[model samples]
Target: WDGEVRQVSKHAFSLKQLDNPARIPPCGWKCSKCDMRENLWLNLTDGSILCGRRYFDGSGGNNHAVEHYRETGYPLAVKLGTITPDGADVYSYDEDDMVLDPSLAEHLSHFGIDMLK
Candidate 1:
């Protein structure tokens, strides 16, 4: 049951932070496949996933992006509702932070995956 539907939004989180699977933030989802650490971002606009950390950006050293290798190790791009597994719940937020994928939404809508209780 590792793959259940969850979003980075109020409606989804109102019940509980499923992505984090914790009642609160920072459920600390770890990865067995790769050694990924904390830090995540979900795009409210397109349901995409991004993960990383600058630790200290803006007024710390130089532009965090300029020095690549990922401030916290990436594959980060910032935008998500893509609903990643536990690993992407680090910064899950409101609907303003994500949008349903149009195609998937349509498919789910027809099938009513949410009603399967």
Candidate 2:
């Protein structure tokens, strides 16, 4: 309600494959599989953070996030470092587009994240 954000998928609420909530670390989170720190995505299912798909120029990511989706069928991820009190970038691999999470604050809570703070 504060930003240009709106929920794009029902999966945000219906999908139910999450692990116990874990306290997210402070910013500068890196890919669990690589040294990539930018273009990182936080998997909503299991809290596994990973780098995004590489750019065609091979400059931005390592596709680890996509691989995690492929392996786990978890459909939602939010870009790290983009989150603010208002909103952040959320994506749905199942939809293959940049979506939104109206309940972003609620979803972030799954990792002890406080988008409001």
Candidate 3:
């Protein structure tokens, strides 16, 4: 029963579990179970994934992106979705086509940025 669809490129999929067979629904997908949704930015040219969260406030900025990589080691990008937490703006990102949007860095200071580490 391993009918899982494999990801061949970086910009071929998003963070939608409903679109992937291995991912669970309701929350799109969890990094522990999904492949394409792993990481914050995946490079198709070298199959290398970037751990952007390690460079910033992962929990508040883009924790999911970090979790994605922690689970699958794939790189992805920021995907801003319509859903919000407590009516606040919720940010999301796609594993493909998404580059490091520095514009978001300023808004994530609440999570704290450690530059000395």
Candidate 4:
């Protein structure tokens, strides 16, 4: 469902990427740090959802997602729109590349999302 999907990343298997206790709804999710609705990313560390980086043209996000990474050292964050039953667009801020989550289904279920449905 994307371009040049990597096999996997060590960050995806980090023990810190804990099972979420929070219950996130399947829809109507927005950035927890800002009001912008699109380009949202889910922090794999603490389930802190946030918007993406702002563009050089000042036409995009508030960069809250990266800000969360800076503050917490959470390496992996997945795009909301790219999520599907097979795979999702997962990014590693630490490695600075788009990586894969082989257990994406299990990881997503930690936050109450079922990709198979």
Q: Write the per-residue lDDT of candidate 1 for residues 1-117, one digit (tens) a residue.
A: 224454443333222111322121223432222344333333222222234433364332222222232333222223222233322222223232322232333222232222122
**lDDT scores in order:** 0.29, 0.81, 0.30, 0.81
Judged by TM-score, which candidate is best?
A: 4
Give the per-residue lDDT digits (tens) of candidate 3, residues 87-112.
Answer: 11212334433233222232222122
How do all models score by TM-score?
0.21, 0.87, 0.22, 0.88
Comparing 1 and 3 by TM-score, which wins? 3
**How many collisions between residues are there in candidate 2?**
0
Model 2 scores worst on lDDT over the 10 consecutive residues at 1-10
Candidate 4 collision pairs: none
Considering lDDT, which of the candidate structures 1 and 2 is the better prediction for this target?
A: 2
List candidate 4 segments past 4 Å from native. none
TM-score of 1: 0.21
Instruction: Give the per-residue lDDT of model 2 (tens digit) for 17-56.
Output: 4666667875879899999978899887788889999779
lDDT of 1 at 14: 24
Worst 10 residues of 4 by lDDT: 12-21
Superior by lDDT: candidate 1 or candidate 4: 4
